[PDB]
Design a protein around this ligand. Structure first.
Ligand SMILES: Cc1cc2nc3c(=O)[nH]c(=O)nc-3n(C[C@H](O)[C@H](O)[C@H](O)COP(=O)(O)O)c2cc1C
Ligand SMILES: O=c1cc(-c2ccc(O)cc2)oc2cc(O)cc(O)c12
Length: 288
């Protein structure tokens, strides 16, 4: 099995070391290993080296991804790579687009795109402003539905490479990801159990009568039993979870419906007139 490790830090920084230490654990379990430093890549925002990167991810059986924490989440570059997964890696649309290709004599999209795959994440921050990065990491695996094995957070980690026990945790994440790639089907999540019995997430959006898992998006309720929190929801909701084929199909169907309504609305006079007034009112300032 091939384990691919990706670092989002500075060249030769702590994320490099944590991600390389994990590759070592993966080689210890008999995996072939490869390492990509994102600072060498040119990746444009979602309106260039991206297709190369995605191609490498497709050939790997498992991936370890180490990102720095910026403002209690992953880097803008991580977010960009998440943005740029949608058009290409959504398990839903690729199942659909494959079927349609078969049934209309289309050409069969890249098979690797639909292969099950395992992925692990480590978030390395310099202080404890780290409340959002795990959920960021999950988001990236949610679009292709890659089975997440570990999704660890490492606060107060400026000097982590001389803290042997945390370096060792990263070696164990390397182990886990290789063992899991040995049998992607029966691989099982190894990380924190968290609060969402489904997502494992600990991030929730809270309004009156509705708590929503920020990762998987079940709407449910959050219960405080003497300072311990838990998340319950109605078993209908599993049908809609954003990390299930069922919920993706629902989500994609509603997108196609509302994109048709949009295309029709853009031919009304209401739309055209309102747009024509906006252009008349003001023009965008650009740098000379
Ligand atoms: C713009 C910026 C924002 C950051 N925000 C956070 C943060 O919110 N919480 C945190 O622990 N660390 C934060 N850090 C520190 C980084 O996580 C740290 O520099 C990084 O893990 C270094 O990794 P490297 O050695 O791989 O480059 C931030 C750093 C920068 C440059
Ligand atoms: O090492 C750090 C560097 C920075 C940073 C980023 C930009 C600046 O002008 C000054 C500091 O923010 C941080 C925020 C944190 O929560 C933790 C850090 O280690 C850092």
């Amino acid at each position: 099995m091939k384990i691919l490790g990706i670092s989002g830090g500075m060249r030769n920084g702590s994320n490099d070391g944590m991600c390389i230490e994990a590759l070592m654990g993966a080689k210890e379990m008999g995996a072939e290993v490869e390492f990509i430093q994102l600072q060498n890549l040119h990746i444009e925002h979602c309106t260039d080296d991206f297709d190369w990167l995605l191609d490498k991810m497709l050939d790997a059986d498992g991936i370890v991804f180490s990102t720095p924490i910026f403002e209690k989440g992953a880097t803008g570059l991580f977010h960009t790579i998440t943005d740029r997964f949608g058009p290409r890696m959504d398990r839903g649309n690729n199942i659909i687009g494959t079927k349609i290709a078969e049934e209309t004599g289309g050409t069969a999209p890249d098979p690797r795109i639909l292969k099950d795959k395992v992925i692990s994440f480590m978030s390395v921050g310099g202080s404890d402003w780290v409340t959002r990065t795990q959920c960021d990491a999950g988001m990236l695996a949610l679009t292709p539905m890659w089975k997440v094995i570990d999704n660890e957070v490492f606060p107060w980690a400026l000097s982590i490479l001389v803290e042997d026990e945390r370096v060792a945790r990263a070696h164990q994440i390397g182990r886990n990801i290789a063992e899991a790639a040995k049998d992607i089907e029966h691989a099982q999540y190894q990380g924190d159990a968290g609060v969402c019995p489904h997502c494992h997430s600990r991030n929730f959006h809270l309004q009156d009568g509705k708590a929503i898992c920020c990762l998987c998006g079940l709407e449910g309720e959050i219960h405080n039993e003497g300072g311990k929190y838990s998340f319950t929801f109605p078993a209908e909701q599993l049908e809609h979870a954003h990390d299930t084929l069922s919920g993706k199909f629902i989500h994609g169907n509603d997108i196609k419906e509302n994109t048709g309504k949009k295309i029709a609305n853009m031919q009304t006079e209401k739309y055209k007139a309102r747009q024509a007034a906006y252009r008349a009112f003001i023009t965008a300032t650009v740098p000379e």
